[PDB]
Design a protein around this ligand. Sequence first.
Ligand SMILES: *[C@@H]1O[C@H](CO)[C@@H](O[C@@H]2O[C@H](CO)[C@@H](O)[C@H](O)[C@H]2NC(C)=O)[C@H](O)[C@H]1NC(C)=O
Ligand SMILES: *[C@@H]1O[C@H](CO)[C@@H](O[C@@H]2O[C@H](CO)[C@@H](O)[C@H](O)[C@H]2NC(C)=O)[C@H](O)[C@H]1NC(C)=O
Ligand SMILES: *[C@@H]1O[C@H](CO)[C@@H](O[C@@H]2O[C@H](CO)[C@@H](O)[C@H](O)[C@H]2NC(C)=O)[C@H](O)[C@H]1NC(C)=O
Ligand code: NAG
Ligand code: NAG
Ligand code: NAG
Ligand code: NAG
Ligand code: NAG
Ligand code: NAG
Lengths: 50, 258, 198, 237
Amino acid sequence: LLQYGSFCTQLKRALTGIAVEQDKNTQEVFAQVKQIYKTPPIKYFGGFNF
Amino acid sequence: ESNKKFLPFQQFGRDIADTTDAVRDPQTLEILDITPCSFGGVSVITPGTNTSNQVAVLYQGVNCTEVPVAIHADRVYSTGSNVFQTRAGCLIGAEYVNNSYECDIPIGAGICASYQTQSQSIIAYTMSLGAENSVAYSNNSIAIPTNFTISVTTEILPVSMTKTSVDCTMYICGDSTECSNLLLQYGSFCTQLKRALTGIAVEQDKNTQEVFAQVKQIYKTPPIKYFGGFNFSQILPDPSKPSKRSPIEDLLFNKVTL
Amino acid sequence: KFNGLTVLPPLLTDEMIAQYTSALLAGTITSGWTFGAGPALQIPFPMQMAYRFNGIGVTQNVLYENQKLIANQFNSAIGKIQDSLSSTPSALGKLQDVVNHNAQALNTLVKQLSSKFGAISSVLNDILSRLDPPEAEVQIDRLITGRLQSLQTYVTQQLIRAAEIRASANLAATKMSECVLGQSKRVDFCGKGYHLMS
Amino acid sequence: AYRFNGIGVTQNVLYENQKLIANQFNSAIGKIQDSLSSTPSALGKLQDVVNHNAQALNTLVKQLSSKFGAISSVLNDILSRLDPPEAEVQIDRLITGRLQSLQTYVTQQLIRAAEIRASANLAATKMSECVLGQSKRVDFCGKGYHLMSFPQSAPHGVVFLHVTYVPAQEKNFTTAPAICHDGKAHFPREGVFVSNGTHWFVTQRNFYEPQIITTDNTFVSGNCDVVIGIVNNTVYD
Ligand SMILES: *[C@@H]1O[C@H](CO)[C@@H](O[C@@H]2O[C@H](CO)[C@@H](O)[C@H](O)[C@H]2NC(C)=O)[C@H](O)[C@H]1NC(C)=O
Ligand SMILES: *[C@@H]1O[C@H](CO)[C@@H](O[C@@H]2O[C@H](CO)[C@@H](O)[C@H](O)[C@H]2NC(C)=O)[C@H](O)[C@H]1NC(C)=O
Ligand SMILES: *[C@@H]1O[C@H](CO)[C@@H](O[C@@H]2O[C@H](CO)[C@@H](O)[C@H](O)[C@H]2NC(C)=O)[C@H](O)[C@H]1NC(C)=O
Ligand SMILES: *[C@@H]1O[C@H](CO)[C@@H](O)[C@H](O)[C@H]1NC(C)=O
Ligand SMILES: *[C@@H]1O[C@H](CO)[C@@H](O)[C@H](O)[C@H]1NC(C)=O
Ligand SMILES: *[C@@H]1O[C@H](CO)[C@@H](O)[C@H](O)[C@H]1NC(C)=O
Ligand SMILES: *[C@@H]1O[C@H](CO)[C@@H](O)[C@H](O)[C@H]1NC(C)=O
Ligand SMILES: *[C@@H]1O[C@H](CO)[C@@H](O)[C@H](O)[C@H]1NC(C)=O
Ligand SMILES: *[C@@H]1O[C@H](CO)[C@@H](O)[C@H](O)[C@H]1NC(C)=O
């Protein structure tokens, strides 16, 4: 198989790029805020129920 | 050992993927399960060579109470030192701490690594999402700003790429008539390749055309640059240099090197 | 873990994503749209509801004089969602298709290993134990070639699917920015009707 | 002043803080050159195009030295050593392998071109919406309330400079939904009722500027026995 060139490097590079892209998708969708806000202990919001 | 209920006439065993996963011992009638031996990938975690020469090693998806010694295929050498077990595999050469910082080098399921001063060493930790904050909510309270800030940010976007063309005869057969005649029997692949490349080049030109040619006139700034105290000298063209480019554009063109 | 094929874990676990979602919900409940453009500023919930009605062309006294009715309607509507999702079986086909396609592709790739490609046998050990060095090459070449095209086809299909997944993720990010962190005037972008909040 | 009015702030806020705003803008525009120059990985997106093109071309030209199970990788060697009726067996393997190399290159190029076209379409939309106008879409033309943008060119790409407004230095206040007076309810026209502890004013939402409550900035439209949390005071005429 060593005589067939360098196909394996291309395959590995493609798969690695796909994986990195997969992580970046979630990173840019969900990490929209810098702080971590917390809801007040008592849940009264004028009659609305969350 | 196997708990499978083999019928008294069958000997082998198979799975959904059609592989051998059971066998019957000939001399003593018994059923044995076969499992493949451990294998995986090896990753090397390093800071820049301008900083240090230490490294850490990650064995991916392997319980490493089972691998103090194994071969590298692509040779036996072990490291010892500090061994930590994670979800993505296990880590050799790094120390686990109880703190939490911003992620620097991603590793696995919420684990990152960094080069710290503790002397300097390589440490592993769980990434921190951010700073905790709670807003004082009440049903008769409000907050109103009393000042403001003007902020300027940048955004970079690619537009086009390089246009290339390829010739079949020169690339494949060089200048051999016999090779060309032999290749003539393979059909009309070359026409398809040429058409695809030509379409790509035309698209590349159209991208820039539709991004930048948004106006019909060519407006010119007034000779005297007074705009109520605002200073646009950094983005307006500079006539002193022959290229007729703004300082920021010059910096951008210098930064990107072929 | 099937013949050189491995699956890597995602970087962000489910708990971290849940924490992100909780933070977004708390921010949009206690502040409104202010926390998406700077510091978070507190405001009572009915007052921002009045602001959101004012943003679609209805005065505030409409909200302030129908508070209980609006709250009851919202509570009933939010209650019906669990039943609506649970009853319909095909409500989550989009998320199931990803798993199905990945499993099918991996199964096809591993099943391709048993083909012969015009050779004496599909097992390398059989050829290495039956034949001799100077003749086994003719048989081995066909196997090597066929497995090579199998791998190439798999990789190309993966790239084509990844492009579509990226497009969908970009749309989801835009919707997160525009429907959740603010109020949208675009028609039929954040639901059907006049948008209030998401 | 028009652009401030477009985000909910009156014009007198600009006209009475002209020098301060100009100085802030000048400092912010000054910091950009240093910010771009210091960071080395600021322009990775534009460098990746060049890197990928060079890598693909290098791989394609390097593939020419493979043998593909032939006696030699040079056509002239086979044409000078062997004879016509036998060289075909060797030449066929080379022709085939070079054919798959070319096909793989072309397919990769098409796949990359699709992504480049998508990015160019996004850039065109941003040019139309952030530069030729003012955008109300959140987080589309920067972070904050959008004011205006400037374009700059770059090798194989474009750079946008977004200018935005950010509030600062908030403060506690007490508020009410409506004001009761003479058995009538009063609501603000634009703004919110606010109290400093003993007196009530009406103010705009994005900047603190109290005013005296008057019939010229309120409307009655109702009665005092329905609203929850109403507070009764005096309304000047
Ligand atoms: C918000 O809605 C939930 C769900 O309807 C309410 O929880 C219910 O409370 C009643 C009374 O305690 C119970 O009988 C139900 O079994 C609860 N339902 C569930 C699903 O747990 C909750 O009480 C509501 N909030 C308020 C403040 O009333
Ligand atoms: C709003 O913020 C600006 C920016 O900091 C304040 O202006 C500064 O005021 C201090 C105090 O005199 C000066 O030392 C700085 O030089 C000013 N900055 C600039 C850029 O001129 C301004 O005072 C703040 N507004 C209020 C009401 O305090
Ligand atoms: C607009 O900003 C530029 C850049 O700060 C100013 O140019 C500076 O001018 C001073 C005084 O002549 C020189 O000492 C600096 O060396 C200049 N900087 C550069 C980078 O050339 C320019 O003066 C400003 N515009 C106005 C009207 O003052
Ligand atoms: C690793 O093997 C040990 C041996 O008993 C076991 O206790 C442990 O749970 C295993 N861990 C993982 C992650 O498989
Ligand atoms: C690290 O220390 C913290 C604080 O004592 C503790 O909560 C955490 O469990 C520790 N992590 C370990 C022991 O892995
Ligand atoms: C709502 O206002 C009442 C006073 O009318 C107060 O007692 C209660 O604590 C407030 N709610 C919250 C969550 O603070
Ligand atoms: C507003 O009130 C809260 C609760 O008392 C307080 O924590 C916060 O600091 C106040 N805001 C300012 C700007 O002081
Ligand atoms: C509130 O504003 C009024 C305006 O007349 C002023 O007289 C009073 O002193 C202020 N109270 C405080 C606590 O600043
Ligand atoms: C004014 O408000 C107070 C506080 O709720 C209330 O007791 C009083 O009755 C109101 N005035 C009139 C005339 O009703």
